Design a protein around this nucleic acid. Structure first.
Ligand code: GDP
Ligand code: GDP
Ligand code: ALF
Ligand code: K
Ligand code: MG
Ligand code: MG
Ligand code: MG
Ligand code: ZN
Lengths: 131, 448, 333, 230, 244, 136
RNA sequence: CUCUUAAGGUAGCCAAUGGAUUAACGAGAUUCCCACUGUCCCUAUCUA
C-alpha cells in the first residue's frame, strides 16, 4: 500500500524466488553453469561476479567480496537454510496431499539436503580461494 | 508476373470527369465568402478552391496511371498479346497523354495559388480562381479521345484469361473446324463454343486439369490460315504469339475427313509452314474425327503426306475422336508425359535445385535395433465399418443431421452425457456433487 | 485502333517471316529473364519479401528533411534575386557532397548575369595536397578559392577581398554590388562573413541551421555581403546516412545512431580513430561503441553502456572535426 | 469467366423473362420522368438539367437540319491541299488606373510606423539582367511571382496565336512612370520577338521585333494576351 | 484414407483434435460439423468425445496419448477428467500429470511403441509416459526444434517431419522410431505438421488447404490405401520435383 | 478480433497502452517490443489505444537484431502484468508483459515461445498454441 | 604587355604549440538521454 512497499515490491521490480534459488543451489551442474557464463553486456560485470544466493550480479570481484562479507548475504543464506516451501507445504498445512508432503520432506532430509550443503560448502571455498 | 488486370478503376470520359471533379469541389469545400471579410480570408478561400480541384484531377489521373499495366515490363507473351489487341503505340501514347495532363494540372494549380497570394480584392481573387479552374477544364477536355480509348481497353483487358507462361501447358492449334474447341471441352470445363463454321473462336481460351497431382493449363486458339505474316491478321497473330512464346506441348489437329473445309494437303502444308514456330517444344499431331474416316483406310498419296508429317523430328501421330473419352484421355496423357519429360530433363541439366530436392525426396528407413514386434493396430469394428455414402437412402444419421433436425447450428444443445459408458444407463443423467461442507468431493472419491 | 468502330485488322509492321519472328521472341524472352534476375537480386530480396511478412519500414524522421523548408528556400531565392555575385561554399572534406548542382543549373539558366564562384572552406581539416587537387579539379568549371574561416587566424581572406574588389571594379557603374553566400548547412558561410569583417557580425554555431533569415553586412562602401541559411536540395540518391555524414541534421534528434556508427568506421581510418579515442581491439561498430563507453564511463543504471549517447557523441565529433577524415579527390590526369 | 462471357451467357441462356417488357415500359415512362425532373429538381441540379436540355434540343435541331440539307440535293497547290491551317491601335482608350490601385503600401518597423515602401500590384516586365536593389534602398517592389517574360500574341492576318518572348515595354497608356517601371496592363504597347512568324521585309531583312498591344488584364487572368500591330 | 476438413474455417486439425488408434477427441466449440467430419470416417467403431481442457479448445496441443493411455496436464479440471473417464472405456488409462510443460501435445510426440519428448521434461514425467503409454522414451529435437509433438506427426506405419530436417537427423530419428520418415508440409506450406494434421494407422485428417502433392506424400508415408505402399516416392518423384 | 484469430474474444483488462515496452518471448532474435498501434482499437477523443492479452499490435524492436530493428511488425501479446478476470472465477496476472512476433495471418516468425502463455491468447491464436511449451 | 588549374596515394612543410572548437564559474538562453513519476490514458479516495 505505502510508497516504499509499492515501489520496492512492484510487479515489474521482482527478484528470483527462494525455491528457485534452492533448485539452483541443489546440484553441482547448476552451480557450474551459474559460475561459468558467457560474457554478456546486458548483465552487470559481463555476467561475472554473480551471487547465487542473492541472485544478484555485482560489477567487480572486490564488490562481490564486500557483498559476501556482509549481513545481507548471511540473511539470505539463513533464509535458504530451511525447507524451500513449495505449494505442498500449504496443502499439507490445510491437510491436503499429506503423504506427498511427507515424501517430499523425507527426500529433502535424505537426498537433496546434504548434497546441497556440500555444494554450498564447495561454492564458498571456491569463492574464498578465487577472491 | 500478374496475369490479371481486372482491378483497374473505372475511367470516366472527359465531360464526366470534369463534372465529377468540379462538383466535388463545389460540394466538399465551403462556398460562402463575403466581400466584407478580411482579404486574407478571401485569399485562403480561393486558394483552397484551386488546390482542392487540382488535387482531385491529379488523384484521378494517378488512379488511371497506376492501374494499367506497363506493357514494356510485363512478360513478352503478355506484351505481344496486348500489342495485338490494343496497338501498343496507341496504348502508350494515351497513357503519356494522361501523364502530361497530370503535370500540366499541377503546374496550373501551383502557379495560380502563387498568383492568388497577391490578390487585392474579392473580384480579382474570384477571377484568378475561375481562370485556374477554366485552364484545368481545357486541359481535361483535351483528353476526350484517350479517355474513351482507355475505358474500352480497361473493359476489354479485365476479361482476358490468366495465362501463366511458366507453368505446364497443352497448346491446341490447327485449321478452323478441326475440333480444337471440342477437344478443350472434352479435357477441361472451359465453356468455349463449338460450332460447325470457321472462326467461332476469336481469342485464346484457357482450361485446366490435373494429371499426376499436377495442375496443367490448356490453351485453345483461333485457327491459323496458311499465309505469310505479312498478310496475317490479328486474330491469327494471337495463335502465332501463343505458339511462339508458351513453352509447352503443341497438339496440331488434323481433320482427314475434310469436313473442316481444308484439304489434307493444305493441312500438311500448314504444319510444315508453322514447323519453325514450335522448335524445342514438345510436338504431337492429333488426327481428330476418327468416327468419320481413319488414317488406315486413306489413299496412298494421303498416307505418304501423313508420313511426311511424321518425318519431322521428333513428332508423333495419335488418333482421337471428340466423342471418344478413352482416346482423348490417352492423347492428353501422352502429351502431358512428353511435357513432363521435357521439363524434368531440362531441370536435370541444372545444379541449383539438387541438394534440396534430394533431401525432400529421400525417405529415411530404420534397421533392426531390437527384436521387438511393432505392427499397425486396426480395430475389428473399424475394419468392419461400412463406407459412408452421403447420397444413400439407408445411411447413418450424423451429429450434424441430428443438430439440423433439432435446432440447427448454434441453437442445438448437445447432451454430452449420452455417450457415457457406465454400469447402469440410468446413471447417465446424474449430477455429480462437488462440494460438501467446505471439502472437495473429488479428492475423497476413491474405491475401497 | 480499338473499339466497336475499330478498322485495324492487321499488324502495322509485320515481321519478315516465322523464323525471324521466333528469333525475336527468343531474344525477348532471354532479355526478360536476364532483367528479372538483375532486378530480383535486389528488390525481391529486399522490399517485396517484407510484404509477405507484413513488415513496414520505420517512418522517415522529420530531422532529415531539415533544409528543405519553404521558408528556407524562400530566403534562398530572395538572396539570389538580390545578389550580383553568388559564392557557393563547399566543405573541403566533401565538396562534391556539398555541391548544390540544381541551384547551379538554375543560376546558369535563368540568371546568367550573376557571377557564381566556389569557396572551398575548412581547408585546415584536410591535407594540403587534397585541397590543391580539389581546387584544381573545381577550377575546370568555376573560379575556386581555398579558404580557412577564422576571425583571428584565417587563410584566403586577402584573396577573397581582392576578388570582390575586382567584381566591384567590373560593375563600377552599379553604385554597389551584393555578394550572397549559399551552400549546405554548417559549411561556414557565417564564419566566412565574420572572417571578412574581422568581427563576429553573424551568429555561428556548430549545430546546423543557426542562421534562419538573411542578413546584410556592409563590407566596404560599395560591397554588401548577404548571409543565407543553409539549403539541402531534395534528392532520391542521397540516403539518410549520406545526409547525416554531410553534417546536415542535428544528431540529438535521430532515433538509432548505432546504425550509423558503421558509416563512421567505413569513412574513418582505424589508426585515426584509435588515436582520437585511445582505444583498440574492436572488430565491429558495436564493440567499438561498447569499448568507448566503458573507457569513458558512459554507463546506464546497473552498468549498462550508453550506446545511444556514445554514438551521438561520435557522430558529433565526426561532423564537427575532432576526428580526421576526408573524401579522396579525383585521380590526377 | 473469360472474353465476352456476358454476351455468350445471353446467347446461351437468354435474358430475364420480363426484360423486354420492362425496358419498353421504362422507355415509355421516360417522358413523364423528364417532365417531373424539370419541374422538381432544384438548385444547381435544376440549372444543369435545363442547360443540358437546351443543348440537346439545339443538337437535335442541327441533326434535322443536316438531314434535310442532305436530302435537298483559296487556290492551294497540290502539296498543300488536304492540309488545314489609319494608324489607330485596337485599344485607343482603356480604363484609368490610379496610383492608389496600382501601388500597395508596405509598412516597415517593429511597430509598423514607417510607410515609404510601395509594392506594384500589377504584372511587370523587368527585362534581362534584373537584380533586386538592396532592401534598405528598395522603395518600389516588383514581386517575382508577378513578373512576366512571354505573351500570347495574335496575328490579325492568318488568324494564329503564338507564345512569344517580350523584349520591352514601349508605352503604358496610364503614365510614363508605369512605362519605365514596366507595368503590364490593358492597352500597354510592348515589343515582342516575332522570329518564329517568318516575316521578311521588302528589302530582304528578317523581322524579329515588332509591336503588340495588351488586350487583357493579366492581374485578373494570370496571363498576358496581346494583338500584334500589323 | 486421408480426408480434409476444417474446424471453424481453420486448417490446424491437430490443434483442435486428438486421434489415436482407439479413440478420438474433438473440441466442443461451435456446431457438430467437425464431429461429423470425424464420424463419417469412424462411425461408432471408436469413441469420439467432445472435450475441453482447462476450458480451452486446444485439446490436441494440451493432451497426449496413444491407444493404451491418455495424459492430461495439471490444468485439467476434475469435471473434465471425470467426463473423459466416463466417455472412454477402461481399456484406455487416463492420467493427470504435474508437469511444468503443460502443452503435452506440443512436447510429446508418440505412437503405440515409442515417444520422442522435449529434452527438458521431468524424470517423473518420463516414467509416467513409459508407464501409462507403455512406450520407449527418447529425448530429442527435430533438427534443433523442440516441441516435437507440434513439429512431427507420427503413427505406427510412418512419420512426417518438418521440411527443414536434415537427412542425417531424419536417419537418426527413423532409427529411433523404427518407422520410415519423410520431410514435407501440410496445409499449403506450413511447417507445423503435427499441429496441422492428425493421423493413426488407418486414417489421416488434414486441413482443406492441403494440396494434392502434399496429400499424396501423406498417404504414401502413412500407408493409408491398400494400394499405397511407402516406397512409391519413386513413382511420385516427377510430381515432387515439379512441386518443389 | 483481428485477421487470423480463431473466433471471438471476450474483454480483458487493458494493460499496455501505445508507447509501452514489453519483452519478446519468441526465439526470433528480438529482445523487446515497443507498441505503436493496437489492431481493432476503437476511436475516442483523448483515449489512448491499449492492448491486452491475446491482442495483435504493431510494434518496433528496440533491442535485438539490427536486421530485425527499424521495422514495424505485427506482434501478439502473450503475457500481461495487469490483473484480469477469468470466467472460471479468479483474477490473475503475470510478472511481465510479453509478446511474440507474427505475420498478419497470426503465424509465428519464431519456432518456440519461452515462458508461460496465457490460455486466452493460446486459444485465440492456433499458431501460438502450437509454438507454446507451457499454456499456463 | 601580363595574371588563375604548377602541388597528389589518409596527414605536410615552415616556425612544446600552431590556438577563439578557450578550462573554470553562472537562479543567463537552448536541444537530447537515463532515472522518475497522477503530465496523461482516466479518474478515484483521504485529512485540515
Ligand atoms: N463427327 C465428328 N465431328 C466432330 C468431331 N470433332 C468435332 N466435330 C465437329 O466439328 C465442328 C466444329 O468443331 P470445333 O470445336 O468448332 O473445331 P474448331 O473450330 O477448330 O475449334 C463441330 O460442330 C463438331 O460437331 C469428331 O470427332 N467427330
Ligand atoms: N575547422 C574549421 N571549422 C570551421 C570553418 N568554418 C566554419 N567552421 C565551423 O563550422 C561550424 C559552423 O559554422 P557556420 O558559419 O555557422 O556554418 P553555416 O551554417 O554555413 O553558417 C562552426 O562551429 C565553425 O566553428 C573552417 O574554416 N575551419
Ligand atoms: F547554414 Al547554417 F547554421 F546551417 F547558417
Ligand atoms: K551553423
Ligand atoms: Mg474453336
Ligand atoms: Mg550561418
Ligand atoms: Mg487530446
Ligand atoms: Zn549474496
Amino acid at each position: 500500500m505505502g510508497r516504499y512497499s509499492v515501489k520496492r515490491y512492484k510487479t515489474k521490480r521482482r527478484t528470483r524466488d527462494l525455491d528457485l534459488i534452492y533448485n539452483d543451489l541443489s546440484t553441482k551442474e547448476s552451480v557450474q553453469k551459474l559460475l561459468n557464463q558467457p560474457l554478456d553486456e546486458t548483465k552487470p560485470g559481463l555476467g561475472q561476479h554473480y551471487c547465487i544466493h542473492c541472485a544478484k550480479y555485482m560489477e567487480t570481484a572486490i564488490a562481490l567480496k564486500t557483498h559476501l562479507k556482509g549481513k545481507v548475504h548471511k540473511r539470505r543464506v539463513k533464509e535458504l537454510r530451511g525447507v524451500p516451501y513449495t505449494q505442498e507445504v500449504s496443502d499439507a498445512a490445510a491437510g491436503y496431499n499429506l503423504n506427498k508432503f511427507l515424501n517430499r520432506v523425507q527426500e529433502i532430509t535424505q537426498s537433496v539436503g546434504p548434497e546441497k550443503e556440500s555444494n554450498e560448502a564447495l561454492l564458498k571455498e571456491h569463492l574464498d580461494s578465487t577472491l | 508476373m500478374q496475369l490479371s488486370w481486372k482491378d483497374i478503376p473505372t475511367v470516366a470520359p472527359a465531360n464526366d470527369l470534369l463534372d465529377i471533379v468540379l462538383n466535388r469541389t463545389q460540394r466538399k469545400t465551403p462556398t460562402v465568402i463575403r466581400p466584407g471579410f478580411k482579404i486574407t480570408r478571401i485569399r485562403a478561400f480561393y486558394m483552397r478552391k484551386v488546390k482542392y480541384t487540382g488535387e482531385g484531377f491529379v488523384e484521378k489521373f494517378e488512379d488511371i496511371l497506376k492501374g494499367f499495366p506497363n506493357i514494356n515490363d510485363v512478360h513478352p507473351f503478355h506484351r505481344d498479346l496486348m500489342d495485338t489487341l490494343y496497338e501498343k503505340n496507341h496504348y502508350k501514347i494515351s497513357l503519356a497523354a494522361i501523364s502530361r495532363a497530370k503535370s500540366l494540372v499541377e503546374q496550373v494549380a501551383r502557379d495560380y495559388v502563387r498568383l492568388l497570394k497577391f490578390g487585392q480584392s474579392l473580384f480579382q481573387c474570384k477571377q484568378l480562381k475561375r481562370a485556374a479552374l477554366g485552364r484545368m477544364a481545357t486541359i481535361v477536355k483535351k483528353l476526350r479521345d484517350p479517355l474513351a480509348y482507355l475505358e474500352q481497353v480497361r473493359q476489354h483487358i479485365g476479361r482476358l484469361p490468366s495465362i501463366d507462361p511458366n507453368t505446364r501447358t497443352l497448346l491446341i492449334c490447327g485449321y478452323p473446324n478441326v475440333g480444337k474447341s471440342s477437344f478443350l471441352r472434352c479435357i477441361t470445363k472451359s465453356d468455349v463454343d463449338v460450332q460447325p463454321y470457321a472462326f467461332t473462336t476469336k481469342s485464346l481460351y484457357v482450361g485446366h486439369f490435373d494429371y499426376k497431382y499436377l495442375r496443367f493449363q490448356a490453351i485453345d486458339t483461333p485457327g491459323i490460315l496458311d499465309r505469310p505474316t505479312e498478310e496475317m491478321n490479328n486474330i491469327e497473330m494471337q495463335s502465332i504469339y501463343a505458339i511462339a512464346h508458351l513453352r509447352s506441348c503443341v497438339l496440331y489437329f488434323m481433320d482427314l475427313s475434310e469436313q473442316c473445309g481444308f484439304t489434307i494437303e493444305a493441312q500438311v502444308k500448314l504444319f510444315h509452314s508453322i514447323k519453325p514456330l514450335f522448335a524445342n517444344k514438345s510436338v504431337m499431331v492429333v488426327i481428330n474425327k476418327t468416327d468419320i474416316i481413319r488414317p488406315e483406310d486413306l489413299d496412298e498419296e494421303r498416307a505418304q503426306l501423313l508420313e511426311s508429317v511424321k518425318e519431322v523430328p521428333g513428332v508423333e501421330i495419335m488418333t482421337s475422336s471428340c466423342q471418344l473419352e478413352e482416346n482423348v484421355m490417352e492423347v492428353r496423357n501422352k502429351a502431358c508425359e512428353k511435357l513432363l519429360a521435357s521439363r524434368i530433363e531440362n531441370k536435370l541439366k541444372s545444379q541449383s535445385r539438387i541438394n534440396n530436392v534430394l533431401n525432400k525426396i529421400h525417405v529415411a528407413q530404420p534397421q533392426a535395433r531390437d527384436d521387438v514386434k511393432r505392427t499397425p493396430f486396426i480395430p475389428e469394428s473399424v475394419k468392419n465399418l461400412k463406407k459412408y455414402d452421403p447420397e444413400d437412402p439407408n445411411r447413418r444419421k450424423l451429429a450434424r443431421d441430428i443438430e439440423a433436425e433439432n435446432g440447427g447450428a448454434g441453437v442445438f444443445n448437445v447432451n454430452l452425457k449420452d455417450k457415457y459408458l457406465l454400469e447402469d444407463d440410468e446413471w447417465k443423467n446424474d449430477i455429480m456433487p462437488e462440494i460438501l461442507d467446505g471439502k472437495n468431493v473429488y479428492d475423497f472419491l476413491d474405491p475401497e | 485502333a480499338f473499339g466497336p468502330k475499330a478498322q485495324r485488322k492487321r499488324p502495322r509492321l509485320a515481321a519478315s517471316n516465322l523464323e525471324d519472328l521466333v528469333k525475336a521472341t527468343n531474344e525477348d524472352i532471354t532479355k526478360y529473364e536476364e532483367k528479372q534476375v538483375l532486378d530480383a537480386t535486389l528488390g525481391l530480396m529486399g522490399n517485396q519479401e517484407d510484404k509477405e511478412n507484413g513488415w513496414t519500414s520505420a517512418a522517415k524522421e522529420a530531422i532529415f528533411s531539415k533544409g528543405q523548408s519553404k521558408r528556407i528556400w524562400n530566403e534562398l531565392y530572395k538572396v539570389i534575386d538580390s545578389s550580383d555575385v553568388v559564392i557557393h561554399v563547399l566543405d573541403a572534406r566533401d565538396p562534391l557532397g556539398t555541391r548544390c548542382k540544381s541551384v547551379e543549373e538554375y543560376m546558369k539558366k535563368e540568371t546568367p548575369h550573376k557571377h557564381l564562384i566556389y569557396v572551398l572552406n575548412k581547408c585546415d581539416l584536410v591535407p594540403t595536397w587534397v585541397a590543391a587537387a580539389w581546387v584544381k579539379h573545381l577550377s575546370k568549371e568555376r573560379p575556386t578559392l581555398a579558404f580557412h574561416a577564422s576571425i583571428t587566424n584565417s587563410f584566403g581572406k586577402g584573396s577573397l577581398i581582392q576578388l570582390l574588389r575586382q567584381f566591384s571594379q567590373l560593375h563600377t557603374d552599379r553604385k554597389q554590388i551584393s555578394v550572397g553566400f549559399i551552400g549546405y548547412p554548417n559549411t561556414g558561410k557565417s564564419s566566412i562573413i565574420n572572417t571578412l569583417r574581422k568581427k563576429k557580425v553573424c551568429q555561428v554555431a556548430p549545430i546546423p541551421g543557426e542562421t534562419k533569415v538573411w542578413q546584410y553586412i556592409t563590407l566596404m562602401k560599395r560591397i554588401f555581403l548577404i548571409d543565407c541559411p543553409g539549403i539541402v536540395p531534395p534528392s532520391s540518391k542521397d540516403s539518410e546516412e549520406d545526409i547525416l555524414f554531410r553534417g546536415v541534421v542535428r544528431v540529438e534528434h535521430v532515433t538509432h545512431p548505432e546504425q550509423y556508427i558503421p558509416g563512421v568506421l567505413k569513412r574513418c581510418q582505424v589508426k585515426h580513430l584509435e588515436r582520437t579515442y585511445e582505444i583498440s581491439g574492436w572488430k565491429d561498430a558495436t564493440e567499438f561503441i561498447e569499448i568507448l563507453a566503458r573507457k569513458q564511463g558512459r554507463l546506464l543504471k546497473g552498468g549498462e553502456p550508453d550506446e545511444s549517447g556514445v554514438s551521438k557523441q561520435i557522430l558529433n565529433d565526426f561532423n564537427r572535426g575532432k576526428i580526421p577524415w576526408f573524401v579522396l579527390p579525383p585521380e590526377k590526369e | 469467366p473469360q472474353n465476352d462471357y456476358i454476351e455468350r451467357h445471353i446467347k446461351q441462356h437468354g435474358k430475364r423473362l420480363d426484360h423486354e417488357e420492362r425496358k419498353r415500359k421504362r422507355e415509355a415512362r421516360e417522358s413523364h420522368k423528364i417532365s417531373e425532373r424539370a419541374q422538381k429538381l432544384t438548385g444547381w441540379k435544376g440549372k444543369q438539367f435545363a442547360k443540358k436540355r437546351y443543348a440537346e434540343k439545339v443538337s437535335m435541331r442541327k441533326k434535322i437540319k443536316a438531314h434535310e440539307q442532305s436530302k435537298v440535293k483559296d487556290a492551294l497547290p497540290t502539296y498543300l491541299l488536304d492540309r488545314e491551317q489609319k494608324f489607330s491601335v485596337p485599344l485607343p482608350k482603356v480604363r484609368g488606373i490610379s496610383e492608389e490601385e496600382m501601388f500597395k503600401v508596405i509598412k516597415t518597423g517593429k511597430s509598423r510606423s514607417k510607410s515609404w515602401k510601395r509594392m506594384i500590384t500589377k504584372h511587370t516586365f523587368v527585362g534581362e539582367g534584373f537584380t533586386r536593389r538592396p532592401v534598405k534602398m528598395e522603395r518600389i517592389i516588383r514581386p517575382s511571382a508577378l513578373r512576366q517574360k512571354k505573351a500570347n500574341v495574335t496575328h490579325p492576318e492568318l488568324g494564329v496565336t503564338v507564345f512569344l518572348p517580350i523584349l520591352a515595354v514601349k508605352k503604358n497608356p496610364q503614365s510614363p512612370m508605369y512605362t519605365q517601371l514596366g507595368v503590364l496592363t490593358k492597352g500597354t504597347i510592348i515589343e515582342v520577338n516575332v522570329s518564329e512568324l517568318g516575316m521578311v521585309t521588302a528589302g530582304g531583312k528578317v523581322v524579329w521585333g515588332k509591336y503588340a498591344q495588351v488586350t487583357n488584364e493579366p492581374d485578373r487572368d494570370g496571363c498576358v494576351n496581346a494583338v500584334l500591330l500589323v | 484414407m486421408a480426408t480434409r476438413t476444417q474446424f471453424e474455417n481453420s486448417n490446424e486439425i491437430g490443434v483442435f483434435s486428438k486421434l489415436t488408434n482407439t479413440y478420438c477427441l474433438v473440441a466442443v466449440g461451435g456446431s457438430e460439423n467437425f464431429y461429423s467430419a470425424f464420424e463419417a470416417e469412424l462411425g461408432d467403431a471408436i469413441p469420439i468425445v467432445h472435450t475441453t481442457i482447462a476450458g480451452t479448445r486446444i485439446i490436441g496441443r494440451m493432451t497426449a496419448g496413444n491407444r493404451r493411455g491418455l495424459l492430461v496436464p495439471t490444468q485439467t479440471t476434475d469435471q473434465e477428467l471425470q467426463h473423459l473417464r466416463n466417455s472412454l472405456p477402461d481399456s484406455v488409462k487416463i492420467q493427470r500429470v504435474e508437469e511444468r510443460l503443460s502443452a503435452l501435445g506440443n512436447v510429446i510426440c508418440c505412437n503405440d511403441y515409442v515417444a520422442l519428448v522435449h529434452p527438458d521434461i521431468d524424470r517423473e514425467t518420463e516414467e509416467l509416459i513409459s508407464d501409462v503409454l507403455g512406450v520407449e522414451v527418447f529425448r530429442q529435437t527435430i533438427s534443433g526444434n523442440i516441441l516435437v509433438g507440434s513439429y512431427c506427426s507420427l503413427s505406427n506405419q510412418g512419420g512426417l517431419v518438418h521440411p527443414q530436417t536434415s537427412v542425417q537427423d531424419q536417419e537418426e530419428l527413423s532409427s529411433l522410431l523404427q518407422v520410415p520418415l519423410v520431410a514435407g508440409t501440410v496445409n499449403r506450406g506450413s511447417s507445423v505438421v503435427g499441429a496441422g494434421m492428425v493421423v493413426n494407422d488407418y486414417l489421416a485428417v488434414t486441413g482443406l488447404d492441403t494440396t494434392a502433392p502434399e496429400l499424396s506424400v501423406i498417404e504414401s508415408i502413412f500407408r493409408l490405401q491398400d494400394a499405397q505402399p511407402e516406397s512409391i516416392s519413386g513413382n511420385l518423384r516427377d510430381t515432387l520435383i515439379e512441386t518443389y | 478480433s483481428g485477421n487470423g484469430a480463431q473466433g471471438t474474444k471476450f474483454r480483458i483488462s487493458l494493460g499496455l497502452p501505445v508507447g509501452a515496452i514489453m519483452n519478446c518471448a519468441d526465439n526470433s532474435g528480438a529482445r523487446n517490443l515497443y507498441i505503436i498501434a493496437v489492431k481493432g482499437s476503437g476511436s475516442r477523443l483523448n483515449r489512448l489505444p491499449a492492448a491486452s492479452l491475446g491482442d495483435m499490435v504493431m510494434a518496433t524492436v528496440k533491442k535485438g537484431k539490427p536486421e530485425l530493428r527499424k521495422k514495424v511488425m505485427p506482434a501478439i501479446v502473450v503475457r500481461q502484468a495487469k490483473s484480469w478476470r477469468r470466467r472460471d472465477g479468479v483474477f490473475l496476472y503475470f510478472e511481465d508483459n510479453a509478446g511474440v512476433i507474427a505475420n498478419p495471418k497470426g503465424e509465428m516468425k519464431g519456432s518456440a515461445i519461452t515462458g508461460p502463455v496465457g490460455k486466452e491468447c493460446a486459444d485465440l491464436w492456433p499458431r501460438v498454441a502450437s509454438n507454446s511449451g507451457v499454456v499456463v
